[PDB]
Design a protein around this ligand. Structure first.
Ligand SMILES: [Cl-]
Ligand SMILES: [Cl-]
Ligand SMILES: [Cl-]
Ligand SMILES: [Cl-]
Ligand SMILES: [K+]
Ligand SMILES: [Mg+2]
Ligand SMILES: [Mg+2]
Ligand SMILES: [Mg+2]
Ligand SMILES: [Mg+2]
Ligand SMILES: [Mg+2]
Ligand SMILES: [Mg+2]
Ligand SMILES: [Mg+2]
Ligand SMILES: [Mg+2]
Ligand SMILES: [Mg+2]
Ligand SMILES: [Mg+2]
Ligand SMILES: [Mg+2]
Ligand SMILES: [Mg+2]
Ligand SMILES: [Mg+2]
Ligand SMILES: [Mg+2]
Ligand SMILES: [Mg+2]
Ligand SMILES: [Mg+2]
Ligand code: NA
Ligand code: NA
Ligand code: NA
Ligand code: NA
Ligand code: NA
Ligand code: NA
Ligand code: NA
Ligand code: NA
Ligand SMILES: [Sr+2]
Ligand SMILES: [Sr+2]
Ligand SMILES: [Sr+2]
Ligand SMILES: [Sr+2]
Ligand SMILES: [Sr+2]
Ligand SMILES: [Sr+2]
Ligand SMILES: [Sr+2]
Ligand SMILES: [Sr+2]
Ligand SMILES: [Sr+2]
Ligand SMILES: [Sr+2]
Ligand SMILES: [Sr+2]
Ligand SMILES: [Sr+2]
Ligand SMILES: [Sr+2]
Ligand SMILES: [Sr+2]
Ligand SMILES: [Sr+2]
Ligand SMILES: [Sr+2]
Lengths: 237, 194, 56, 92
RNA sequence: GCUUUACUGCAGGCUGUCGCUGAGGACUCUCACUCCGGGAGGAGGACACCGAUAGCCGGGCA
RNA sequence: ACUCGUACGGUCACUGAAUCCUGCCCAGUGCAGGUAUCUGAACACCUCGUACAAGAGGACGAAGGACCUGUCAACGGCGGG
RNA sequence: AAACAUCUCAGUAUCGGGAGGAACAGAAAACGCAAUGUGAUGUCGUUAGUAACCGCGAGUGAACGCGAUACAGCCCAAACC
């Protein structure tokens, strides 16, 4: 047959690329020598094209102007801190070790100094649970208990823009506009609606996959479609 | 009496034992951080180099080359093939890695000609070889009774035509009798069946 | 719109031009590569054994 | 059918009639060192391997008798044409 | 051209084994190697990645 | 490439606005999990064989299968008497 | 090969790299008319569709030697300095 859409994606051609030349910045935490003697002031709030959420421009003492992953409740004029001794307040960044248990945080680093990997989407947040000298236990947005190096930095509070998902797109045109700001091919043609040559589910007088949808983890690309290695399907049981 | 050289030789018969073992463990760490072709002031295996024609003289150059380990790096057939010509994984190339190394070295030094080469070990993902190259345009060499032969026009790009020692062995030219029916005087003249 | 005559009217783009190296009107001014002699692609001159009968 | 375990018949070795014992020919074990064994290895590789990719044929509804006839006095056995028999049971 | 529990193979994935690969049927360590860090250093660690091979799946492909 | 992206994400599929609803079936096939025992390759190891080798057999046994379980908004099924 | 998978077409077509006026080969860890024998290497004639290979099918297919052509043999590494 012909390569399926999922395979065309990988070549990274324009149709599948994100409009990076239009993106603003990668909200990674600032790098501090130590001391925590680094503070800045929120100079403005902006829209982040890549995440459909707001971001805050901060001017730091040492003259560095950078965009930051803003939690809810950060406004212009406010002063933020980044360091071990940073004050424990919304919008401030410091290593999990310094963060008091039971405090919601976002933009959590995976490995100390990486800049932040977890809980960055609209209105989300990780929940710092257990402390220790060897491991900090955080509960990520998906509900998974994650063991992290207490040296991993994080921002106090939940991410701005919460509830974005509560409003329906209502029309195709709205979906359209959002999709144009992401690395995605949209709209979506169902596999069952294509010719046999174009997809494992194509072909047949009437539409229907001529096979079970749960595909094995070991299936090669081109064949791994439908419900990948599902542990189960449906709503029952 | 035994030459000092024999000691370098004897050490390399078991690169995995004794002091040499420790040297390699140390060295490779640096080699891994070096490029594909690094010129070096002195041969790592002196006895071997001198034995192959090396000399401490103007116009004589030595370079270490590293190449990825393993079989062929081939792309599967995009057009129709009978089962026989569909193989991809276990297919290996006809040139040994040392030959690939000699050619890369010679490319790096367009004006020099490959004299010979030898192995200096490998790790799990690559192999290293040092190559002796000669400057056919330098008078110190044009006047050498042992090396001036390499200055002849028909010796230009000798490595690319299989005229190296590694080249000749790889072409099945070692044997003078049985088994060399299709290798001598050339693979091509014998229809390419050797 | 038909792929024939009506679609031919839209053709006013310049692609292949006289080549600096070989003189043929084959220098693709958008790719900056000569489809005839290889200029812009290779220092060596574009050539192929299939340009003639195999035994000639 | 039934078959006597022993009986008098011609022994082509003694060249005279003598008592023989009948036994079903038991398959001898292979060594894996015969020419065919080496050809299979030399000629099998990537892709189809010709004859070495063919798999065992079928069966006939009934097989022919496959027996050994051992002379009771010289100890040597001889073979004979077999005959189709659904089952062969020896008497005694 | 297309399909599949047609024949035969080939990619690919999973898995064991050997090499990379070190010290003291379950274990500790650090020194290769890997990752994070601007750096110091941190995390991991003879595993993983990679080379070789073996079994399984394998119209994704011929 | 996705990705200046991080589960309020984005990948893979099915259905196709709202409204009222969406029953029964896990035997077969698919996926997934488990698994005392059974089966399950090669290297190493042991025996026989060979002054060696080919080779024969053994022991150990990974995934996988047998076997058990989960799963139909998974392929599909919901008859005759 | 009256299908076709090994095999064949064929190391052919075509592609990458490179030298010369010619290339390449070449002074035996050879040969093994087994010898009290030959004596670097191409090439030509022959050995021969022979030996060998092969769904032992279709097909593929040498060498030593011999008669010729032309002839040519040397230089390092190390030992000791
Ligand atoms: Cl969306
Ligand atoms: Cl060269
Ligand atoms: Cl019988
Ligand atoms: Cl002779
Ligand atoms: K063919
Ligand atoms: Mg960022
Ligand atoms: Mg777009
Ligand atoms: Mg659709
Ligand atoms: Mg259609
Ligand atoms: Mg298909
Ligand atoms: Mg349907
Ligand atoms: Mg429909
Ligand atoms: Mg001298
Ligand atoms: Mg990196
Ligand atoms: Mg097909
Ligand atoms: Mg419709
Ligand atoms: Mg035919
Ligand atoms: Mg020739
Ligand atoms: Mg036939
Ligand atoms: Mg042939
Ligand atoms: Mg011979
Ligand atoms: Na060169
Ligand atoms: Na063979
Ligand atoms: Na067609
Ligand atoms: Na079922
Ligand atoms: Na035919
Ligand atoms: Na046909
Ligand atoms: Na054959
Ligand atoms: Na004679
Ligand atoms: Sr980042
Ligand atoms: Sr960064
Ligand atoms: Sr279909
Ligand atoms: Sr249900
Ligand atoms: Sr050149
Ligand atoms: Sr139209
Ligand atoms: Sr018109
Ligand atoms: Sr136009
Ligand atoms: Sr170019
Ligand atoms: Sr050409
Ligand atoms: Sr073979
Ligand atoms: Sr095979
Ligand atoms: Sr039958
Ligand atoms: Sr509806
Ligand atoms: Sr089931
Ligand atoms: Sr002569």
């Amino acid at each position: 047959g012909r390569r399926i859409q999922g395979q065309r994606r990988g070549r990274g051609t324009s149709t599948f690329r994100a409009p990076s030349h239009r993106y603003k910045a990668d909200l990674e935490h600032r790098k501090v020598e130590d001391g925590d003697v680094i503070a800045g002031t929120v100079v403005d709030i902006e829209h982040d094209p890549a995440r459909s959420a707001p971001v805050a421009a901060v001017e730091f003492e040492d003259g560095d102007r950078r965009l930051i992953l803003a939690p809810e409740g950060v406004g212009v004029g406010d002063e933020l801190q980044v360091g071990v001794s940073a004050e424990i307040a919304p919008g401030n960044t410091l290593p999990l070790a310094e963060i008091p248990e039971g405090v919601p945080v976002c933009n959590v680093e995976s490995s100390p100094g990486d800049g932040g990997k977890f809980a960055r989407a609209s209105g989300v947040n990780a929940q710092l649970l257990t402390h220790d000298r060897n491991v900090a236990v955080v509960k990520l947005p998906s509900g998974e208990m994650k063991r992290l190096d207490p040296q991993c930095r994080a921002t106090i509070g939940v991410v701005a823009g919460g509830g974005r998902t509560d409003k329906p797109f209502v029309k195709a045109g709205n979906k359209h506009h959002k999709m144009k700001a992401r690395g995605t091919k949209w709209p979506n043609v169902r596999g069952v609606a294509m010719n046999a040559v174009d997809h494992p589910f194509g072909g047949g007088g009437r539409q229907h996959p001529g096979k079970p949808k749960s595909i094995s983890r070991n299936a090669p690309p081109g064949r791994k479609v439908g419900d990948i290695a599902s542990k189960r399907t449906g709503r029952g049981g | 009496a035994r030459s000092a050289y024999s000691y370098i030789r004897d050490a390399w018969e078991n690169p995995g034992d004794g002091q040499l073992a420790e040297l390699q463990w140390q060295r490779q760490q640096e080699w891994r951080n070096e490029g594909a072709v690094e010129r070096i002031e002195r041969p790592t295996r002196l006895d071997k180099a001198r034995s192959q024609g090396y000399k401490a003289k103007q116009g004589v150059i030595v370079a270490r080359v590293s190449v990825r380990k393993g079989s062929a790096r081939k792309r599967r057939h995009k057009a129709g093939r009978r089962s026989k010509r569909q193989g991809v994984t276990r297919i290996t190339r006809r040139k040994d890695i040392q030959r690939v190394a000699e050619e890369r070295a010679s490319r790096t030094f367009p004006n020099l000609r490959v004299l010979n080469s030898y192995s200096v070990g490998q790790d799990g993902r690559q192999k290293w070889h040092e190559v002796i190259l000669i400057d056919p345009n330098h008078p110190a060499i044009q006047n050498d009774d042992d090396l001036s032969w390499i200055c002849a026009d028909d010796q230009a790009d000798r490595v690319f035509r299989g005229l190296t020692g590694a080249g000749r062995r790889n072409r099945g030219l070692s044997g003078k009798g049985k088994g060399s029916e299709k290798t001598r005087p050339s693979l091509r003249s014998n229809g390419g069946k050797a | 719109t038909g792929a024939g005559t009506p679609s031919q009217g839209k053709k006013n783009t310049t692609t292949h031009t006289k080549c600096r190296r070989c003189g043929e009107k084959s220098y693709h001014t958008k790719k900056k590569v000569c489809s005839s002699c290889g200029f812009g692609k290779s220092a060596k001159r574009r050539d192929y054994e299939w340009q003639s009968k195999a035994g000639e | 059918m039934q078959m006597p375990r022993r009986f008098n018949t011609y022994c082509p070795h003694c060249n005279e009639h003598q008592e023989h014992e009948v036994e079903k020919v038991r398959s001898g074990r292979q060594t894996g060192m015969k020419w065919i064994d080496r050809q299979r290895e030399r000629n099998s590789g990537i892709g189809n391997d010709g004859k070495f990719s063919k798999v065992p044929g079928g069966d006939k509804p009934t097989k022919k008798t496959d027996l050994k006839y051992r002379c009771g006095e010289c100890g040597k056995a001889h073979l004979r044409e077999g005959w189709r028999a659904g089952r062969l049971e020896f008497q005694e």
